[PDB]
Design a protein around this ligand. Structure first.
Ligand SMILES: Cc1cc2nc3c(=O)[nH]c(=O)nc-3n(C[C@H](O)[C@H](O)[C@H](O)COP(=O)(O)OP(=O)(O)OC[C@H]3O[C@@H](n4cnc5c(N)ncnc54)[C@H](O)[C@@H]3O)c2cc1C
Ligand SMILES: NC(=O)c1ccc[n+]([C@@H]2O[C@H](COP(=O)([O-])OP(=O)(O)OC[C@H]3O[C@@H](n4cnc5c(N)ncnc54)[C@H](O)[C@@H]3O)[C@@H](O)[C@H]2O)c1
Ligand SMILES: O=C(O)[C@@H]1C[C@@H](O)CN1
Ligand SMILES: [Mg+2]
Length: 1218
């Protein structure tokens, strides 16, 4: 048996002094990066004056030849609105998908121009409207208002006819064939390059591949590069690497798992492919440049650059090139490494200095990951100073490297032109620019009549489909408010402003290098409310080295879990806890609780309840905050335990510990916002938790109950007692008294013994719906000492769907599907179970999905390279496999990864894709790595949403579409608690996506949300921000009816319920950039009313209607005559039920009666099929005395919606931040 973590994440090679200096700068504070860059970028006053003069001359030339764009002239000629211009370009794009010119022209003339375009053109015309919106308006709108565009297109065609369609088609043809690309094919691009090569320009061709999803994709990009190198080398015809053309490649195009976590596969499989392309470039003697991509790929790419430059088979050729990004904090240290590598190898490395193309994505990623700082600067001027400083370094090393200064900024250009001084020869250095963007500037640079410096044009090559895929990211490079190209086109920007010297501006700032004011550090995402949890950068070699040792040390510890009663640990039956990925690996030992001691623990909790309730709320919250600090400090050790006990990967263990820290801090802050003397605790609360989030959900339930003033009996899942015991140790260290928090390890009958104990005042359950139903039945024969039902929070299973239409980007979909379905071996309650693909795109996405499936690494999770770990037990494995084989036996197509022999020592299920005929083929939640796929016709979308709802579950739900009409339709009709738009459906974040479902998926209130603590006290406080100015109109009609009947007091109570209801609350919660996180209060559905008196019925109806609900009223109440002559609006919401089980499912219940009536009704309600119902009961006298006898918190339904607003390829809000 391999030693735990002995091979967790060894680096590709020992890290040199130069490599370590790179890693040390990864997230260095911005104030620390800038001073040395200012120093390096400083130039003489004479040079600065000369540079400003040169920059002014260039800018005066640029503004002097600047004409209106073709799209602007089109909009002007036909008086188009912005939406019409966008709609026109989308139509033109669609018409150009018709390959035959005569056919297209006939369609335009005979069909498109003469009325209905809809009849003639499965795929919305407006799939790429966000891109065309950037072209027309200069502004990025993340999703497409396709109803507005359809109206605009009808309007413009009916107004202007064939001539405007013709002009749009010709414009789009020119832009997509000659501007966004140099040519559709490498041969076409080469033909069109002669003109500017004759003027002194050169070329590097960008074949536009990136982000391979499958082996087949990577092979396709490889053969595309190979064929392009032949065409370029044939055309180069011996011109060499400086005068002649070259190619640029992206390493992410050449392997589907290009990442540090897969470093071994990258060096074994990706590196030989790059070497083969480099060998071909060497034979033709052309440049081959490695483009720079995301920050977490920088250092990995250095290992490829190193091997290639040391490889003797490539000797004699100086064409190997490499991009470094000046917006990155590591840039000068990366250059030091490259310059030294060039010296050692004797290869004159071609170094393209750029600023960087992924800025807004890097901001979002660091925030999501809770990392210490950003790997890029946050003020644009800092990137400018960094660029100039790094140019000074490169210009001092032209004997060993070939600097290539890629920029469209005339100030940057001028500064470097004068920095380089008087001596020049071709081959010393060059400038670079983008095709269709930089030529106006560089036609003032190239040539003996200008500055006589060469410029290499980066020339995209590809079809319409290929160029549109990431055109948004390219547009933002030069189209943001801080971009030079955007500013030179802004008449409100003066030339004096444009020639401002970034070096001297930064030098004169009060705090040199300060972070941008409007960008939050990840730790400060929530501002004054609470401190964000911190993650770990698994791309950072120092972090991986430190984590390796902490994880190894964690595996040497003798972890135990004992029954920790108030009086001390108790004796019991002891057994080992085994690693689910390798049963030979003993993680620790658990002593499980006898049923006698579980009953004893509840009595001790009851005796201790007054002492814990008397700890003031702020001090209880301080315990939670101290516990969060302790978990943050101990995260590395906690990771190792979760990895080995629960079969989790390192990434998932980090997220798990982060969620625990976030629960502690969120419930502490919510406590400080709400809890006072009148919010009395329930009493002893039994917290029963599942194995699959063995620290986060465990901690969340306990922390909430404790901080609300309740002593807790913690019963962790039998599979995962060790991390639970450590959580309890931490909470006790943080100041939770032993009498307030008792740990009772064991199985379901320890849980049941706790639930059944006479002093149990509340139950918090997360687990399967079947077990929650058994707990519900147990509690149905129970009343509190005050004669009211024992509160139960029961958060249960899901049958989670994702709907994908033909507007979604397949690569994005597949990544989100692979993550949502197979992360944690599908053992998240949020996991994607049913993928629903629009028929027109289903086969293409399915092929990509299966290809991505086979790139997953399954194994014991103490290796960073493992993507999917084991299932938790052999019983879980057998249950999942039985489902798979049943499906296979029915003839359903089944796709499965092959498992390595090493998995035999643990319990593994291979990630599996099962193609279903209809959603009804699924009967129960299958809690494993099993994705089901169904197909749907676009016209049947509404029926499909019905089918998803018809399972009765309602936990997580995903939608991939660009189309506002589809977003509005689907999100209004789906019934689920957590919605996700254009992103994955897992990893809901505390206080950002409050988590919890409806129907068979939960009772609520949501964990990680503002209603949670109020369920754990006898009188609920008013949550922060919890109110609504909207009044339900049926409630109003009912109040008027009551006044008409003479029931004046009930009418007043109804109006009060209408005002007090928070139905219609609609909030945006603070979170990361590039995401909109929404929280809304809706009706629950149909509420079962069990009244006893006429006044009681009126109060129950007022409560239910004020919260937007319909009702079913118990016909056995005999109160039919109390509701005569209702207004039709109210009658529509009212039904009478003799057979409650026939008229469900309900979403809650209100009960009136004495204690034994309540107990009887509670038993009958628990026996209803389907969802657990959140029941509220009151006596007739309570209804008369207490306006809040029925609490309106529990009659609304919380919905969380998380929208990825960066999905179109950039962040509109961050285009204004520089
Ligand atoms: C020939 C060529 C090759 C290129 N190759 C690559 C490549 O392989 N990898 C790559 O990542 N990109 C590449 N780029 C893009 C380049 O990195 C820039 O994104 C783009 O060209 C605009 O920079 P600029 O000097 O032209 O103009 P500018 O307007 O001077 O600079 C714009 C840049 O400033 C930076 N910036 C904007 N806002 C902020 C902020 N708030 N904080 C910090 N920095 C900010 C961004 O990097 C932005 O792109 C290439 C560009 C060219 C012309
Ligand atoms: N909605 C959510 O937030 C959420 C979160 C995570 C998991 N889940 C659900 O949890 C399920 C998987 O987790 P699990 O396998 O640990 O669930 P489970 O139902 O098998 O057990 C959960 C806990 O209940 C206890 N238990 C079993 N029988 C009991 C009984 N008769 N009385 C009292 N307690 C009893 C168990 O010991 C365990 O601590 C899945 O259905 C998943 O969807 C839901
Ligand atoms: O959404 C998810 O996957 C996790 C599980 C719940 O605790 C909420 N956060
Ligand atoms: Mg179980």
């Amino acid at each position: 048996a391999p030693a735990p973590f002995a091979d967790f994440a060894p680096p590709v090679r020992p890290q040199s002094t130069l490599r370590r200096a790179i890693t040390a700068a990864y997230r260095r504070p911005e104030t620390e990066c800038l001073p040395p860059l200012v120093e390096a970028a400083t130039q003489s006053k004479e040079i600065r004056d000369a540079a400003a003069s040169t920059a002014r001359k260039l800018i005066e030339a640029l503004r002097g030849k600047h004409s209106g764009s073709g799209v602007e002239g089109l909009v002007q000629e036909y008086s188009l609105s912005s939406q019409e211009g966008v709609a026109l370009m989308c139509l033109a794009e669609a018409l150009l998908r018709i390959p035959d010119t005569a056919t297209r022209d006939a369609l335009i003339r005979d069909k498109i121009a003469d009325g209905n375009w809809k009849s003639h053109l499965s795929r919305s015309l407006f799939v790429n409207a966000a891109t065309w919106g950037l072209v027309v308006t200069g502004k990025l709108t993340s999703t497409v208002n396709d109803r507005s565009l359809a109206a605009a297109l009808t309007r413009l065609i009916s107004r202007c006819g064939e001539p405007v369609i013709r002009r749009g088609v010709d414009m789009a043809m020119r832009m997509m064939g000659e501007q966004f690309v140099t040519g559709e094919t490498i041969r076409e691009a080469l033909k069109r390059s002669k003109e500017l090569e004759e003027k002194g320009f050169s070329y590097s061709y960008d074949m536009l591949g990136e982000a391979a999803t499958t082996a087949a994709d990577a092979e396709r990009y490889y053969r595309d590069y190979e064929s392009a190198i032949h065409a370029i080398g044939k055309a180069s015809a011996g011109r060499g690497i400086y005068e002649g053309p070259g190619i640029s490649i992206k390493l992410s195009a050449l392997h589907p798992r290009y990442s540090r976590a897969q470093a071994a596969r990258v060096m074994g499989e990706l590196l030989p492919r790059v070497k083969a392309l480099a060998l071909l470039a060497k034979n033709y003697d052309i440049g081959l440049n490695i483009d720079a991509e995301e920050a977490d790929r920088l250092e990995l790419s250095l290992d490829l650059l190193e091997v290639l430059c040391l490889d003797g088979d490539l000797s004699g050729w100086n064409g190997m090139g490499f991009v470094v990004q000046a917006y990155g904090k590591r840039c000068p240290f990366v250059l030091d490494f490259i310059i030294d590598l060039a010296r050692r190898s004797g290869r004159r490395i071609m170094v393209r200095l750029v600023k960087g193309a992924y800025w807004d994505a890097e901001i979002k990623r660091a925030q999501l990951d809770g990392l210490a700082d950003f790997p890029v600067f946050t003020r644009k001027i800092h990137t400018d100073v960094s660029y100039i400083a790094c140019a000074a370094k490169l210009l001092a090393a032209t004997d060993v490297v070939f600097p290539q200064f890629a920029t469209h900024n005339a100030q940057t250009l001028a500064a470097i032109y004068h920095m380089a001084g008087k001596d020049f020869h071709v081959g010393k250095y060059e400038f670079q620019c983008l095709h269709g963007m930089g030529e106006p500037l560089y036609e003032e640079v190239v040539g003996r009549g200008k500055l006589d410096r060469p410029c290499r044009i980066y020339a995209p090559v590809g079809t319409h489909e290929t160029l549109l895929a990431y055109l948004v990211r390219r547009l933002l490079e030069n189209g943001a408010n801080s971009s030079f190209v955007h500013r030179i086109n802004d008449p409100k920007v003066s030339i004096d402003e444009l020639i401002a010297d970034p070096v001297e501006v930064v030098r004169a700032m009060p705090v040199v290098g300060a972070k941008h004011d409007r960008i939050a550090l990840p730790a400060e995402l929530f501002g004054d409310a609470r401190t964000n949890s911190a993650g770990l950068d698994l791309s950072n070699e120092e972090t991986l080295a430190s984590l390796t040792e902490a994880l190894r040390e964690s595996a040497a510890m003798k972890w135990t879990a004992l029954p920790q009663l108030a009086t001390g640990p108790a004796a019991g039956e002891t057994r080992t806890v085994l690693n689910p990925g390798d049963h030979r690996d003993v993680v620790g030992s658990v002593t499980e609780t006898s049923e006698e001691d579980a009953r004893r623990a509840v009595r001790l909790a009851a005796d201790a309840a007054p002492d814990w309730a008397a700890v003031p709320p702020s001090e209880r919250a301080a315990c939670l905050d101290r516990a969060a600090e302790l978990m943050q400090a101990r995260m590395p050790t906690l990771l190792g335990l979760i990895i080995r006990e629960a079969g989790k990967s390192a990434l998932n263990a980090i997220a798990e510990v982060r969620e625990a820290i976030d629960f502690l801090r969120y419930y502490a802050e919510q406590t400080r916002r709400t809890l006072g003397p009148g919010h009395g605790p329930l009493g002893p609360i039994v917290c029963i938790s599942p194995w699959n989030f063995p620290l986060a959900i465990f901690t969340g339930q306990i922390a909430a109950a404790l901080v609300a003033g309740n002593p807790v009996l913690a019963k962790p899942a039998e599979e995962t007692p060790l991390i639970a015991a450590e959580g309890v140790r931490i909470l006790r260290e943080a100041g939770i008294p032993a009498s307030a928090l008792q740990l009772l390890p064991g199985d379901g009958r320890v849980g049941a013994a706790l639930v059944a104990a006479a002093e149990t005042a509340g139950v918090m359950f997360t687990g399967s719906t079947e077990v929650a139903r058994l707990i519900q039945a147990q509690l149905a024969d129970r009343l509190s000492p005050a004669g009211r039902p024992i509160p139960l929070i029961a958060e249960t299973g899901g049958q989670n769907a994702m709907i994908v239409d033909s507007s979604a980007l397949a690569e994005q979909v597949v990544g989100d599907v692979i993550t949502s379905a197979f992360d944690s071996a599908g053992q998240r309650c949020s996991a994607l179970r049913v993928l629903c693909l629009q028929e027109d795109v289903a086969d293409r996405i399915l092929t990509m999905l299966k290809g991505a499936l086979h790139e997953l690494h399954i194994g014991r999770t103490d290796r960073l390279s493992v993507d999917v770990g084991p299932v938790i037990t052999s019983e879980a494995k057998d249950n999942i496999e039985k489902h798979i084989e049943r499906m296979r036996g029915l003839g359903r197509k089944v796709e499965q990864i092959g498992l390595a022999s090493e998995t035999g020592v643990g319990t593994f299920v291979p990630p599996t894709i099962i193609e279903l005929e209809k959603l009804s083929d699924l009967q129960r939640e299958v809690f494993g790595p099993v994705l089901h796929v169904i197909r749907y016709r676009r016209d049947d979308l509404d029926r499909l949403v019905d089918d998803v709802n018809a399972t009765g579950y309602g936990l997580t739900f995903g939608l991939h579409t660009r189309l506002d009409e589809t977003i509005a339709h689907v999100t209004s009709r789906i019934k689920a608690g957590n919605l996700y738009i254009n992103r994955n459906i897992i990893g809901a974040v505390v206080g950002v996506q409050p988590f919890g479902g409806r129907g068979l998926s939960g009772t609520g209130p949501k964990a990680g949300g503002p209603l949670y603590l109020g369920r754990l006290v006898t009188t609920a406080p008013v949550p922060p921000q919890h109110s609504s100015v909207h009044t339900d109109p049926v409630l109003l009609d009912f109040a008027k009816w009551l006044d008409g009947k003479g029931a004046r007091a009930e009418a007043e109570a109804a109006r009060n319920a209408g005002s007090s209801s928070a139905l219609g609350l609609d909030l945006e919660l603070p979170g990361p950039v590039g995401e909109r996180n929404l929280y809304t209060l809706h009706a629950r559905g149909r509420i079962l009313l069990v009244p006893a008196t006429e006044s009681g019925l009126y109060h129950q109806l007022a409560a239910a209607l004020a919260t937007g609900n319909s009702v079913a009223i118990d016909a056995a109440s005999g109160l039919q005559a109390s509701l005569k002559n209702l207004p039709q609006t109210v009658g529509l919401r009212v039904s009478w039920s003799k057979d409650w089980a026939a008229d469900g499912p309900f979403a809650g219940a209100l009960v009136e009666g004495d204690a034994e009536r309540i107990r009887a009704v509670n038993k009958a309600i628990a026996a209803l099929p389907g969802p657990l119902l959140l029941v509220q009961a009151a006596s007739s006298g309570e209804i008369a005395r207490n306006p809040d006898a029925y609490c309106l918190n529990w009659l609304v339904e919380e919905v969380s919606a998380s929208i990825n607003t960066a999905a179109a390829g950039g962040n509109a809000s961050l285009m204004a931040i520089g």
